[PDB]
Amino acid sequence: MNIFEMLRIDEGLRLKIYKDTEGYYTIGIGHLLTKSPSLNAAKSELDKAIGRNCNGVITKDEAEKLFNQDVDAAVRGILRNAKLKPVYDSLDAVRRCALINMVFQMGETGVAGFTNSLRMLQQKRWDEAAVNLAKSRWYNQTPNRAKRVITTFRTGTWDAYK
């Protein structure tokens, strides 16, 4: 198990533009094309992202390439952030994937707002962090995913993703 297999479980793989649970145009493995209620905007952003005329359809390799780019952007989002970086640095390999997962989902600034839970993680207070993250709107918006991520923070294992 790894960050790539982890996010594939959470995001799923689809080679055609589709609307996620929130009604946002998405493709590949959790790649948000646009928040705009516009298929043209979705397709437009897709063509730029892939570098060809896709017509809302990409290949497996293209999806995996774009996925690798999004993961890199998530890690860079963590490492450029004063609040997320020291936490990340202190975390083990498994727990780092959980943090990366969060930033992949809601972006740098979103996760950085959980200041208290971030302190707890850095101080290796896993259960406290788990309890506090469960109070968030993030948990409320995507509870199934949050449970898997939070469990990963708590156990430091891949039990939630088998």
List the catalytic residues: 11, 20
Q: List binders of a copy of itself among 100-159 (CB under 8 A).
A: 107-110, 113-117, 119, 132, 135-137
The rounded distance, in Å, linking the Cα atoms of 42 and 68 is 20
Q: CA nearest 45: which of 54, 16, 23? A: 54
Q: Where are the beta strands (DSSP E) in the chain?
A: 14-19, 25-28, 31-34
Number of residues that bind a copy of itself (CB under 8 A): 26
The residue from 27, 29, 34, 97 that contacts a copy of itself (CB under 8 A) is 34
- Residue (12 or 113) nearer to a copy of itself, CB: 113
Instruction: Kindly state the smallest distance separating residue 154's Cβ from Cl ion, in Å.
Output: 15
Instruction: Kindly state the smallest distance separating residue 24's Cβ from Cl ion, in Å.
Output: 9
Amino acid 29 reads I
Helix, strand, coil content of the chain in percent (nearest 5): 60, 10, 30
- Residue (8 or 119) nearer to Cl ion, CB: 119
Report what 135 binds from Cl ion, a copy of itself, none; CB cut-off 5-8 Å by kind.
a copy of itself
Strand 31-34, strand 14-19: pairing: unpaired
What order do you get walking across the sheet with 14-19 strand by strand? 14-19, 25-28, 31-34
Q: CA nearest 88: which of 52, 122, 45? A: 122
- In the shown chain, the binding pattern of residues 59 to 78 toward a copy of itself, with x for contact by CB under 8 A and - for none, equals --------------------
Binding site for a copy of itself (CB under 8 A): 22, 24, 32, 34-38, 40-41, 44-45, 107-110, 113-117, 119, 132, 135-137
